[PDB]
Write a structure and sequence with these properties.
Length: 423
């Protein structure tokens, strides 16, 4: 009862973030072990419960061994503070984390879901890295033992053969008897393609040089037969206890290099965020009425532009294609049915640290931003979910970062409201 799904609001009507950025302590637990990095959270809010997952890795945040994947089912509640607060209900770990490629969460009605892709295992039980051996799906519910669903070849179909599969850490959604997630990985290709290659004014050579770079940017180490692609995953047949997963791939002509994504419910339609993994660092966000590649329309707005965690050297203005890697994540949350209004967090490099802001983008392109997290040395990611709380739109933002320069990376939660105004 304390929160509800967002109700989009009904002279210039503008929206802006609230003045303050309140802490949401202990949304999930954390050890002080300086040799552990907490990274790649997934955060989903349903009707009242939330779902949260985090990878705990040894030493290295990017390639370090996954020591644990920790899951929290909780509730967003009022504890008499200035903003909404979190109450964990279940703290649980994914079995056999060394076999996991990645997992993400989806919050439902008094229950939550964890979808994980796994790699193959040797006879020793050790993982064979870079591979794919189907999925595990877990259903978490208070006062109910976790239900596990092993989903191997007989129970999934992908429109292309994937040698590796990673669930998009942004998370998934439940709609009725189905779950929807996003995944990315290595898919096999045998046909020619013309990769998406939208950019600004870029000085060319022969004229097709940038298109060649765009094609090569979606290939795996220069191989035309292994591409890094995105796919929608639909999880069918939940009530039967034998779920079936159907996957549908975005062609390179409709996507940049595959990356971590997120599914959204947007009124009676749906949304998709795709983090930049490559040379195109603008916002990549699609709206679809039925969750299909054919019906996914991309927002024209550019913000946020990913400016950290990239080997690219192109400009924010022209974004010229090149072979480079981007590893950040900064999603948005729609504040209107067409997502022409939305909130997000921006992050800019400041030598080893970052400067950060929370923002609302209005349908006319106006950006209302406020500097945030100035007491943090660096913030490197953001995922945002908003909802109704005490008769207003409130949001919770989950951010990886380092409080002080020498600290190990941790995951932090804050809240803020959305203000509605007329000028
Ligand atoms: Cl080609
Ligand atoms: Cl069913
Ligand atoms: Cl930005």
């Amino acid at each position: 009862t304390t929160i509800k799904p967002i109700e989009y609001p009904k002279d210039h009507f503008t929206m802006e973030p609230g003045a303050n950025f309140y802490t949401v302590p202990n949304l999930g637990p954390a050890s002080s072990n300086s040799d552990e990095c907490y990274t790649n959270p997934s955060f989903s809010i349903g009707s009242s419960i939330y779902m949260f997952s985090q990878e705990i890795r040894k030493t290295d945040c990017t390639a370090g061994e996954i020591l644990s994947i920790q899951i929290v089912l909780g509730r967003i509640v009022d504890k008499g503070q200035q903003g909404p607060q979190a109450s964990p209900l279940l703290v649980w770990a994914v079995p056999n984390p060394k076999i996991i490629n990645s997992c993400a969460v989806a919050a439902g009605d008094e229950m939550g879901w964890v979808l994980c892709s796994v790699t193959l295992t040797a006879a020793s039980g050790e993982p064979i890295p870079h591979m794919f051996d189907g999925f595990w799906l877990y259903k978490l519910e208070p006062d109910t033992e976790v239900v596990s669903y092993r989903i191997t070849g007989y129970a999934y179909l992908l429109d292309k053969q994937y040698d590796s599969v990673f669930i998009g850490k942004g998370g998934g959604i439940q709609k009725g008897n189905d779950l929807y997630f996003q995944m990315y990985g290595l898919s096999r290709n045998r046909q020619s393609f013309k990769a998406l290659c939208e950019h600004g004014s870029c000085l060319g050579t022969g004229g097709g040089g940038y298109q060649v770079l765009c094609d090569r940017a979606v290939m795996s180490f220069g191989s035309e037969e292994s591409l890094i692609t995105n796919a929608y995953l639909k999880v069918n047949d939940l009530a039967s206890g034998k779920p079936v997963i159907i996957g549908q791939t975005f062609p390179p002509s409709d996507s940049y290099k595959g990356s971590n994504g997120r599914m959204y419910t947007i009124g009676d339609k749906y949304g998709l965020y795709l983090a930049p993994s490559s040379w195109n660092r603008y916002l990549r966000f699609g709206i679809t009425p039925d969750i299909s590649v054919r019906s996914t329309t991309w927002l024209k707005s550019q913000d946020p532009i990913m400016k950290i965690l990239s080997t690219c050297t192109n400009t924010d203005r022209d974004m010229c294609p090149e072979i480079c890697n981007t590893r950040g994540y900064q999603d948005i949350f729609p504040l209107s049915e067409d997502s022409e209004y939305y909130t997000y967090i921006g992050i800019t490099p400041n030598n080893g640290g970052t400067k950060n802001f929370v923002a609302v983008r209005d349908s006319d392109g106006h950006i209302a931003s406020i500097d945030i997290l100035q007491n943090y040395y660096s913030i490197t990611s953001a995922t945002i979910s908003c909802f109704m709380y005490k008769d207003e739109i409130w949001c919770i933002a989950i951010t990886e970062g380092k409080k002080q320069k020498d600290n190990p990376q941790r995951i932090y939660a804050h809240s803020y409201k959305i203000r509605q105004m007329c000028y």
